[PDB]
Amino acid sequence: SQLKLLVTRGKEQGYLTYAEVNDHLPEDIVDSDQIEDIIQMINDMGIQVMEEAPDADDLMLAENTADEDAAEAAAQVLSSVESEIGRTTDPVRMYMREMGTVELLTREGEIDIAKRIEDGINQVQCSVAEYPEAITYLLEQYDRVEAEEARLSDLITGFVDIDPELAREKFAELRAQYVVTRDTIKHATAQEEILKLSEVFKQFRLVPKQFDYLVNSMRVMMDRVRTQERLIMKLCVEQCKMPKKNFITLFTGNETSDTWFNAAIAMNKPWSEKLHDVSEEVHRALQKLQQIEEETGLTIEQVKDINRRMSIGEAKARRAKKEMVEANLRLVISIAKKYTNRGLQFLDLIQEGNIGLMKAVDKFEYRRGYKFSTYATWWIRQAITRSIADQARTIRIPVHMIETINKLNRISRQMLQEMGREPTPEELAERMLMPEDKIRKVLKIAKEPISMETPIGDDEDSHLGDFIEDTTLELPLDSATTESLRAATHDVLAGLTAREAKVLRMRFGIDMNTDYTLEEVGKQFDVTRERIRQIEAKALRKLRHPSRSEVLRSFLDD
Amino acid sequence: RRRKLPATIILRALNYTTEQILDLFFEKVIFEIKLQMELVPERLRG
Amino acid sequence: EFDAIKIALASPDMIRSWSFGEVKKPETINYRTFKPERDGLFCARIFGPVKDYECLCGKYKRLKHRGVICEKCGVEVTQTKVRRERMGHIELASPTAHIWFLKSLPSRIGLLLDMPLRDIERVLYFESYVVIEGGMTNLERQQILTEEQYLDALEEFGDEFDAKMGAEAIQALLKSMDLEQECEQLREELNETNSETKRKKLTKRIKLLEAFVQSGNKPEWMILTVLPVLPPDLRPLVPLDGGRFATSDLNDLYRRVINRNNRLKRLLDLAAPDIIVRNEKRMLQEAVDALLDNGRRGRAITGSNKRPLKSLADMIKGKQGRFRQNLLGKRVDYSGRSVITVGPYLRLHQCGLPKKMALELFKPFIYGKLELRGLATTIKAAKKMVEREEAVVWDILDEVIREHPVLLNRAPTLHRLGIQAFEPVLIEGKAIQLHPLVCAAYNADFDGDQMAVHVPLTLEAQLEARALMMSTNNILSPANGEPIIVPSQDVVLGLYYMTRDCVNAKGEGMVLTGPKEAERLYRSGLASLHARVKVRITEYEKDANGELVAKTSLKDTTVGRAILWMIVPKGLPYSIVNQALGKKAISKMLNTCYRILGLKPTVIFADQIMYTGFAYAARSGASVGIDDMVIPEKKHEIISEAEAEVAEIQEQFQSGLVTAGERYNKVIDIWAAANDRVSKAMMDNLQTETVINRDGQEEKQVSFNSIYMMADSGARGSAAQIRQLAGMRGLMAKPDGSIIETPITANFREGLNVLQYFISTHGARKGLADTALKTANSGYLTRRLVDVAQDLVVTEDDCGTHEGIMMTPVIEGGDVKEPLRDRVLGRVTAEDVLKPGTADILVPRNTLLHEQWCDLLEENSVDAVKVRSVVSCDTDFGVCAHCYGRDLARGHIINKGEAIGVIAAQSIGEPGTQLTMRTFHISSIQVKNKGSIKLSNVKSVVNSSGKLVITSRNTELKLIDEFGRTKESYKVPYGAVLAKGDGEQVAGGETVANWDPHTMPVITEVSGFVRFTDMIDGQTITRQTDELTGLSSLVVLDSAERTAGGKDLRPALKIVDAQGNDVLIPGTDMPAQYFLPGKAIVQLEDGVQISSGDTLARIPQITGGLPRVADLFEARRPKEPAILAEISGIVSFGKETKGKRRLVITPVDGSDPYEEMIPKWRQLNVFEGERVERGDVISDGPEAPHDILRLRGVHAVTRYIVNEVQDVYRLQGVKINDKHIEVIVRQMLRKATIVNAGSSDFLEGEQVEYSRVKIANRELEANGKVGATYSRDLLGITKASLATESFISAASFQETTRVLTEAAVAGKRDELRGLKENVIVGRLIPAGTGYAYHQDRMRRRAA
Ligand SMILES: [Zn+2]
Ligand SMILES: [Zn+2]
């Protein structure tokens, strides 16, 4: 205990200097962040931790609030951080700490984790291409872009073979392969025919969006079966206490007909008679399970093996590609140290780098054999500078328009010395080929402009918010002018009769929220808007006269 | 303005030993035998 | 309209309920058109239109479309002022802890989860996994699992193991925590855990738990999941000049949160690796901390400016925050300022307003009166007319200005006479002209001060101005009721010059028919202004039934006193103007006119005094010249004498006879005595001139020298500055406090040479620095006292108590520093006061002791009056009108609804700024008067030789004359050599006591033989062999170097018979042995003939300033607290030196648990067989005030403080009525601690508001059950202000975040009921004319 003697000495003398805390810090902690966190911990007692020997009156003037419960929980803290050394809360320091825990990669380790990614997505495509309705969608997609509803060489990346005629060749390959398998289902070589049907697709080259569509469409056709596997198990083992060996034997393995369930309503058990609770429920799952069998050409247990090939292969490669992502985190931090002081915080530049680093891995091709630290350096050069372009100023500037200023910042700095004293704005019309107005609005744009806690200062500690005036308010001279104009109209319209005042109250919006038109006022009285226009012009001429306009003419600003 | 160290540490880091430090900062009346102390005539005041 | 303001925690559904949409993009505006975006930070679909009744698209721009929502941009056609009040929400993609509920120091989340703060801040920043309802898989719920430990404990356990990190973990902890289930199990273990720390922690947690169930908040609401954004008109994006803009920093913080939430949204859309999403969630949590409070986590992030950003906490908290800087200190229309000038043609009730300022301030008044009379038709015509300022708008404005006060206010508004209302008189020029009498009430001189002038608009505020704030309604100082409109410097020179006689002036010895003849003689130039004549004077006296009995006599006056008699009203006698009439004499004259005649004739009299003083000071021609400083001719001789003396002591320091310290002390004393000698010579040279004569002989008289005429009248300054003009300057100080030993033998009628002028600048620069540093902290104490005393308003007419302090004047030793007529005046008699015959009631009860009653009881020589005090009032949240007394700014009894807490805060603060801002410490009894001696605690013994030595402890001396009142009050030492007997009236000039601090005997009661038993030298005594005479001395020892064989045992001073039989104590069956504490000089022998009262065992041997009134109110515990006698009963010692001695006071009929840890360095007043009652002295020195409240009554810490605070005020000379310290003390100790909880609904260890205790105990005794007893607590005035009831009030002087978090988690309410509450809220105060409005609203609730 030394920091407890620091607490006791501070409350025993009414102050603390920097010398007393620096003599009562422990031996293990080094850097200045944590020790001024400790200064805050002792400073909100508050025992007035300031620099020098304090004055004489300012211990009796300075007050000690609030005894003692904040000091109770601070004693609970300060007698307990005398044990561990690794405590800080900074995401930058803790990010350096949890980033050093991942080692780098070699060249060989990089390409073999890349081929782990390649064989992982190959296992995913093995699970995809082992399903027929994806290739039925491929049939109907090539059919719908046979009418050129899309662009097929943009819908698929040609094929892995540039030309639509060879894209026609491999699709004429498909429909012949499809009919020598599906038409000859009637089961000896039919699954071998689907096998040859599966082989001809794994040399087709597509777009990931037109790849991900059929993956997620069978995903909702997968978890529906996983909902069916939930629909049985949530309502057999716990609903009725049917034992799971009746679930392990009867359902699990067969899964197909209406025999694993509806024959168990005669097992002479509590749960067997309790299946009448769930006989009508899973009869909806007795059809919709086999409806999926009407949508695969296979059985449900063969679907349970298809997505389990898909899930584990995805869980291998996405973990593999994150093992490549985690390895090159030391690369990204070296790049973001060069882009730091241009507006955005340090952790934000980094986290936009790992976003492109994840996207660089998805488009990295190790068959080219270049190093990965040359490919991902392009994306982090984009993604850091793009988020510096997109998300750094309080007023968002479009990305190219930043490059207009950045080219202007790069050129006008160069003509500051290559010309003489200053570069004029009209001189910059000569150097860059922007014609003196699309160069002028570039320099009209502000820069993260001014705070409104901006000290003016030394007036009343006044800030810049104290002197900005609102022009869009209502000054009470104009408002009482407007209010007295409301009553001065009401007395001039007291000098008119029933009809002419009322059209003049509904041609404009006088105590009604329109401003009807000439026919609309004439719609009320069935007049074809001509006498209504005259009786407006008659009453308007009636209000033109002196000693009829003796109050209103003064109401006009003259 | 860091933590304190006892200020003979800065003399020891400058390679001064204990007898050399006392050689610097003190005055030496010497005792001998029987039981004689040589006197400085001013040094007695207290 | 709302009647209460309720604080809670925001539900996430409620945050979405306030919202008008979601902010999704961190764009603010369009950057090209400066237009609001589609879903950006300054959205228009969410917050509204940028222009009033106009869409962003442009289609439905008509005022006919009001209320519709456009189909192209989604905005609603409304006013653009609706985006001042429209919020949106931010649905955060991950939960995030509220940093107010985490990094507060009580840390409500941490205190709630039964986990320390390091636990939750480790889990929240993604280090540790946390078990939430972990089944039965070998774990503990709410446990830290570090990452590797979680991984290897997930092994061998197929259960899902329920371990989260981050705010998902803390949210599922806070949701799954049942508060009331935990309350029942906590009370269940509270049934079986009566320890100290265990029971303390259990009840300490259960307090927040019982509040959290009774509030209605949910604990999962502390973890935020959806974030409210401010309206865009509270973080605006104003377009400035030249294309430049200006935003608030909340825009940057909300942009940071929207950026990190969008990126976290993508990083959880992307199935990223967990470390970068951990870093993203931790970053977003940090951004929420920086947005809500930029700096409670560390560090406060700076933008493109190197100051930290202002966050939402920083927008409510702080000096510049809305709670301080915008809820009270706010600019005001219908106001203006200009400099002040004198213009003394005014009356007391008018200021001189300029004409351009009255044209500007009174503009709507001018418009209404100008078009009502119809000189303009349109308000545009009125605007153009008074912009032209035609010849008629001055007539309309002087019509408007007639009886319409203006609040003239000067800036350091220390008290309520800084704002007074004046009727405005239109002058030209541009300076406010201001009546010269109230310049001493504003402390406003004419070296260029500016007074701000406001206008009261309403008839209620016009009548508040006229009825309270008019400068004639406030002519008594509210601190002490003396008039504050004292004529200050030129008026007193005029009144002193006309009324001060001359020995041979023109027109001596004439006889005039009255003052009319006197003014006719003076104004024609036949008589001088001061010539002793015999004027016939008609002076009226109302010494009857309000009669004004007239009486005409023939007085021996001067001419000018007769001329001044014309302006006197009737009720005053002539002898009040028959004198010199300096400054204090005009103060007493205006005071007499007020006390006799009332308020209006005092105002007319003060105006006529001011006019006559200026006029006859003008006709004085009172110049100042270079021959008005007569340098004394003996000044050269006193300077040469002191130079010869310091030459002699310079020799005797060169000779080594004295050292340099004593030589510096001797030359400082010599030069200061020479400076006093020179000042005495010049002041005797100046105040007596020689004039000649009626008979031609030499005749001394008081000199008409204008510098003496200014110093002696009290016009300006005093004889110290006249010493620095004519006499020598003196010894000059240093900023070190030291004194420059080479003095300044010159002055200011001669010059100063370069050395003395460089010497003077140390003291003058220190004085001006301390002046200009004190004015930057003028009303810090006034602020600190209005915080404690905000909500004290007189609410009751008479509560009907019988208690109160019993007031007696400050007789400290000789004289009385402040008599009874100063204190007991205006207070209410708590009892019936009888005559000294103890036979008839003098003043009945419930009486306002005015000056007639106090004159009566001072004629009856009454001495012990029990006033009605504020600290013993029987009403709640207020005082009654009689337990306070009278108003002192009016002379009447107080009204119902005067804010006496704020008034007393100002009347301690505004006289308190006249105190020094830095603190400063400074044989036989001199028997002078004669009379009877009274003694309390009187148990004396006779001696054989006729002398006396008192053997009772606190027998202090009281001398009474034949008048009842005390004459000489002193502390008699324990056994000092008295020549005083008992009770017999002695004559003055004979010593009553020969004290010696070397003499504290243990003088006997009965005569006899002092033999010694249990007496061993060596282990109890020292070997004391006095060679001095050859006497047997046994001087006893402390616990230092004796044995432990005789340490606990005590030596016997046993006085026995001539045979050796143990004589009894008279009254007590114990023996006669007087066992001794440390260091007693004993001369005894075994078996020597000594008498009763023999000298057996003798024992050997004012701060001022404003920091003292700082430390007296904060109630500091001094480092040497005079320890007391905690309980009545006779005393014994305790354990010898385990660091501290113990001392067991043993009550003869009660238990004795108190063996107090007494240090041996603070020596005993008492012997260890000496009976002292409770509240009696043990140590010597500054008595701690809490010990006065615990032991003695509440009138003994009330009497202690208001005599110790007034010992600071009367030390400097500042007078203040002691109501004002009593309402602060009454609001100080409104805390009681419970000890017997009884059938009352409070805990044992509970500190609560005392007037809630006294009403529950009023009602729970009003049933057939019995109520609690309580021990009163007293606190400091920065700590008493902490425990307010309100949270809107408390957040304006305390730290807002700790206040608002403590208020929110309690689900607290604020029925407003307070001065600072309703001022912020915008209602009437519950004090003033708005008391009846708070009756009118407290009528409709009991409907
Ligand atoms: Zn629109
Ligand atoms: Zn009362």
UniProtKB/Swiss-Prot annotation, chain B:
It comes from the Bacteria. The RNAP catalytic core consists of 2 alpha, 1 beta, 1 beta' and 1 omega subunit. When a sigma factor is associated with the core the holoenzyme is formed, which can initiate transcription. Belongs to the RNA polymerase beta chain family. DNA-dependent RNA polymerase catalyzes the transcription of DNA into RNA using the four ribonucleoside triphosphates as substrates. This is DNA-directed RNA polymerase subunit beta. It comes from Escherichia coli O157:H7.
Curated annotation (Swiss-Prot), chain C:
One of its GO terms (biological process) is response to heat. Changing residue 767 to A/C: Resistant to antibiotics salinamide A and B. Keywords: Acetylation, Antibiotic resistance, DNA-directed RNA polymerase, Magnesium, Metal-binding, Nucleotidyltransferase, Transcription, Transferase, Zinc. This is DNA-directed RNA polymerase subunit beta'. Changing residue 675 to D: Resistant to antibiotics salinamide A and B. It comes from the Bacteria. The keyword Nucleotidyltransferase applies. Pfam families: RNA_pol_Rpb1_1, RNA_pol_Rpb1_2, RNA_pol_Rpb1_3, RNA_pol_Rpb1_4, RNA_pol_Rpb1_5. Zn(2+) 1 binds at residues 55, 57, 70, 73. Changing residue 760 to A: Resistant to antibiotics salinamide A and B. Its EC number is 2.7.7.6. Changing residue 764 to T/V: Resistant to antibiotics salinamide A and B. The modification N6-acetyllysine is found at residue 958. Mg(2+) binds at residues 445, 447, 449. The RNAP catalytic core consists of 2 alpha, 1 beta, 1 beta' and 1 omega subunit. When a sigma factor is associated with the core the holoenzyme is formed, which can initiate transcription. The rRNA transcription and antitermination complex (rrnTAC) consists of RNAP, NusA, NusB, NusE (rpsJ), NusG, SubB, ribosomal protein S4, DNA and precursor rRNA; S4 is more flexible than other subunits. It catalyses: RNA(n) + a ribonucleoside 5'-triphosphate = RNA(n+1) + diphosphate. Changing residue 743 to S/T: Resistant to antibiotics salinamide A and B. Acetylated on several lysine residues in the presence of glucose. Zn(2+) 2 binds at residues 799, 873, 880, 883. Belongs to the RNA polymerase beta' chain family. GO terms for cellular component: cytoplasm; cytosol; cytosolic DNA-directed RNA polymerase complex; membrane; transcription elongation factor complex.
